[PDB]
Enzyme design. Structure first.
Site, PDB file in Angstrom:
ATOM      1  N   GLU A   1      45.609  36.616  26.078  1.00 14.13           N
ATOM      2  CA  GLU A   1      44.411  37.441  25.956  1.00 14.13           C
ATOM      3  C   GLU A   1      44.713  38.917  26.194  1.00 14.13           C
ATOM      4  OE1 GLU A   1      42.476  34.173  28.508  1.00 14.13           O
ATOM      5  OE2 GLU A   1      40.988  35.750  28.320  1.00 14.13           O
TER       6      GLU A   1
ATOM      7  N   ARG B   1      36.206  30.622  34.131  1.00 15.48           N
ATOM      8  CA  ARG B   1      37.349  30.405  35.009  1.00 15.48           C
ATOM      9  C   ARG B   1      37.143  31.001  36.406  1.00 15.48           C
ATOM     10  NH1 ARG B   1      41.434  32.737  30.519  1.00 15.48           N
ATOM     11  NH2 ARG B   1      39.558  34.078  30.245  1.00 15.48           N
ATOM     12  N   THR B   2      36.566  32.199  36.463  1.00 18.26           N
ATOM     13  CA  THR B   2      36.181  32.818  37.757  1.00 18.26           C
ATOM     14  C   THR B   2      35.284  31.919  38.601  1.00 18.26           C
ATOM     15  OG1 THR B   2      36.462  35.106  37.042  1.00 18.26           O
ATOM     16  CG2 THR B   2      34.780  34.739  38.765  1.00 18.26           C
TER      17      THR B   2
ATOM     18  N   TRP C   1      46.282  30.080  32.130  1.00 16.91           N
ATOM     19  CA  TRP C   1      45.023  29.314  32.182  1.00 16.91           C
ATOM     20  C   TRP C   1      44.224  29.710  30.930  1.00 16.91           C
ATOM     21  CZ3 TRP C   1      41.261  28.926  37.038  1.00 16.91           C
ATOM     22  CH2 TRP C   1      40.172  28.117  36.688  1.00 16.91           C
TER      23      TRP C   1
ATOM     24  N   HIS D   1      38.446  37.842  38.689  1.00 12.80           N
ATOM     25  CA  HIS D   1      37.952  37.978  37.344  1.00 12.80           C
ATOM     26  C   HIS D   1      38.802  37.222  36.350  1.00 12.80           C
ATOM     27  CE1 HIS D   1      40.661  40.992  35.411  1.00 12.80           C
ATOM     28  NE2 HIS D   1      40.605  41.705  36.523  1.00 12.80           N
ATOM     29  N   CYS D   2      38.170  36.834  35.263  1.00 15.65           N
ATOM     30  CA  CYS D   2      38.892  36.283  34.130  1.00 15.65           C
ATOM     31  C   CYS D   2      38.649  37.248  32.966  1.00 15.65           C
ATOM     32  CB  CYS D   2      38.421  34.854  33.842  1.00 15.65           C
ATOM     33  SG  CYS D   2      36.642  34.533  33.967  1.00 15.65           S
TER      34      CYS D   2
ATOM     35  N   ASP E   1      41.640  30.549  28.012  1.00  9.82           N
ATOM     36  CA  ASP E   1      40.240  30.885  27.805  1.00  9.82           C
ATOM     37  C   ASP E   1      39.390  29.656  27.432  1.00  9.82           C
ATOM     38  OD1 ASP E   1      38.116  32.668  27.712  1.00  9.82           O
ATOM     39  OD2 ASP E   1      38.813  33.743  25.902  1.00  9.82           O
TER      40      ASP E   1
HETATM   41  O1  CSN Z   1      30.405  33.068  28.463  1.00  8.96           O
HETATM   42  N1  CSN Z   1      30.977  33.828  27.677  1.00  8.96           N
HETATM   43  O2  CSN Z   1      30.317  34.390  26.804  1.00  8.96           O
HETATM   44  C1  CSN Z   1      32.366  34.005  27.718  1.00  8.96           C
HETATM   45  C2  CSN Z   1      32.970  34.924  26.857  1.00  8.96           C
HETATM   46  C3  CSN Z   1      34.341  35.078  26.860  1.00  8.96           C
HETATM   47  C4  CSN Z   1      35.109  34.315  27.731  1.00  8.96           C
HETATM   48  O3  CSN Z   1      36.450  34.475  27.706  1.00  8.96           O
HETATM   49  C5  CSN Z   1      34.513  33.392  28.596  1.00  8.96           C
HETATM   50  O4  CSN Z   1      35.264  32.637  29.454  1.00  8.96           O
HETATM   51  S1  CSN Z   1      35.685  33.226  30.843  1.00  8.96           S
HETATM   52  O5  CSN Z   1      36.499  34.443  30.613  1.00  8.96           O
HETATM   53  O6  CSN Z   1      36.467  32.196  31.531  1.00  8.96           O
HETATM   54  O7  CSN Z   1      34.451  33.587  31.579  1.00  8.96           O
HETATM   55  C6  CSN Z   1      33.133  33.237  28.590  1.00  8.96           C
END
Ligand code: CSN
Ligand code: CSN
EC number: 3.1.3.48
Lengths: 282, 282
Positions: free
Chosen positions: B104, B223-224, B168, B216-217, B170
């Site tokens: 990412e 993930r957070t 990990w 944070h993710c 996405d």
């Molecule tokens: O809910 N969302 O719209 C969302 C968008 C991008 C993400 O990559 C995601 O996953 S996250 O990063 O683990 O929170 C969640």
């Protein structure tokens, strides 16, 4: 300065006039009278505004501060426990916050029954108490949590989350920081429980008188008012509500003693200052 | 079973109602709005609860789950890096856990600057990155650690330990075993750093908004939230806090998407079951 000595003295002046005006006369028509028989008021001079009374046999009031709807009451007398539990169950209570300490409740002289930490039978109501989480609030002050399950033949069984500040100190004020942490916990507990009711399509959601957090300390005027003030400042719908508004509202809707002590008003002043909320109305 | 299909269906149902209630309206007052200006939200529908916002120009929230105090945020936008570093330094951050994948980060179209694996300058702030240990978490999942030293003229220099899980993926959940190992490493890293500040008599120790692990993710919701839930189950103070509580608390204090995917909620259920912790509130 909006929060300086001159502003504080003016706020005090307006509130003192209001306390005086609201002082109960003998057989005051503004206040609930025992109906009675049985003692209604835990303290002679701490009375229950009649038009916002919850039940004819409790010292308890609906209070709305801005948009924030609560119930404030005294610690129920022994004779009042069945009626108190009926109030709790009918209200679909999303959180009961008890701010009397374990030491106060344990003191038999004070006549404050330990009604939420043990199971019991109260007339046609049975109550089961279970211990849940404990949450530190700062300064070593601890919130002990419980669920109370209230049962009564021909009534829906209701469980109520309880937040008990078991070591609220008897010799010192609780800080604005601990107050804010407690308002956050009480609000969060209510929101989780209210959500469960909304999820099930409860008809209580449509009723202005129901789903109100219930808050009591001993008299329901000092510690109770400090927390209710902090809760109304936590509510995102209450932008621009002044300290003068919040306290005047609590006073008119319960009694003129609401926010009993200077230290309590000082907490509300300090929280308002932290938000840049006005003390006084223009 | 309190961990069976029926229980799980009821949990999801309660959580769904909450997500829907929390959905941000256009210009919602419960949520932080862009102060101009530059983009605030990385994703337009993933918003930042105003009352718990850390800074006006970040999508980042203080979250307390039971007793566990953290900060959850989105991966900072380029234009937010300077403010993000100022949050990290002011918080005396004991650990920064980054759960966004190296893939990412590397994807230039995602606009996720590589702000912790290299040194750099962000307005008045200079940041030096140093690699430290690597800890395996299971299933080939790897935690790469770093130390970010944040300097700004006339400000105290602060070093922040970083735990980066770069593999990990996405929109997934790593297993409950990996999650538990990661929560242990993150908690342990914070504990060591917090101990250092206490040894030095840091004023941050007394302040409830400070010394919070920052997690944070990419969006700071999937993930957070899986990690924050695991950390709160690793906290000895949180006996009896339910999964319903933990998730409702994360949602109310950040947004209704916390715990984004079924598989993420499933890891929290599995961790709860392992501890005999309740799924639902009574
Ligand atoms: O809910 N969302 O719209 C969302 C968008 C991008 C993400 O990559 C995601 O996953 S996250 O990063 O683990 O929170 C969640
Ligand atoms: O006026 N009173 O009757 C009274 C008595 C004892 C209290 O502790 C108190 O304070 S209160 O319980 O916080 O309202 C008030």
């Amino acid at each position: 300065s909006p929060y300086g000595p001159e502003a504080r003295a003016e706020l005090s002046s307006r509130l003192t006039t209001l306390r005086n005006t609201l002082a109960p006369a003998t057989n005051d028509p503004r206040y609930l009278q025992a109906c009675g028989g049985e003692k209604l008021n835990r303290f002679r001079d701490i009375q229950c505004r009649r038009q916002t009374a919850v039940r004819a046999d409790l010292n308890a009031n609906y209070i709305q501060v801005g948009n924030t709807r609560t119930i404030a009451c005294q610690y129920p007398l022994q004779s009042q426990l069945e009626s108190h539990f009926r109030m709790l169950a009918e209200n679909r209570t999303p959180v009961l916050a008890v701010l009397a300490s374990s030491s106060e409740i344990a003191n038999q002289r004070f006549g404050m029954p330990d009604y939420f930490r043990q199971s019991g039978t109260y007339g046609s109501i049975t109550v089961e108490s279970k211990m849940t989480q404990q949450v530190g609030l700062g300064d070593g002050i601890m919130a002990d949590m419980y669920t109370l399950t209230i049962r009564e033949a021909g009534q829906k069984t209701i469980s109520v989350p309880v937040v008990h500040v078991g070591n609220w100190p008897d010799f010192t004020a609780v800080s604005s920081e601990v107050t804010k942490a407690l308002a956050s916990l009480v609000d969060q507990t209510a929101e989780t429980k209210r959500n469960m009711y909304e999820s099930k399509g409860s008809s209580a959601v449509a009723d202005d008188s129901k789903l109100r957090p219930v808050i009591h300390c001993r008299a329901g005027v000092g510690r109770t008012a400090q927390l209710i003030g902090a809760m109304c400042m936590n509510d995102s719908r209450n932008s621009q509500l002044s300290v003068e508004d919040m306290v005047s509202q609590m006073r008119v809707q319960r009694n003129g003693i609401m926010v009993q002590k200077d230290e309590q008003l000082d907490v509300l002043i300090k929280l308002a200052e932290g938000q840049g909320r006005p003390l006084l109305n223009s």
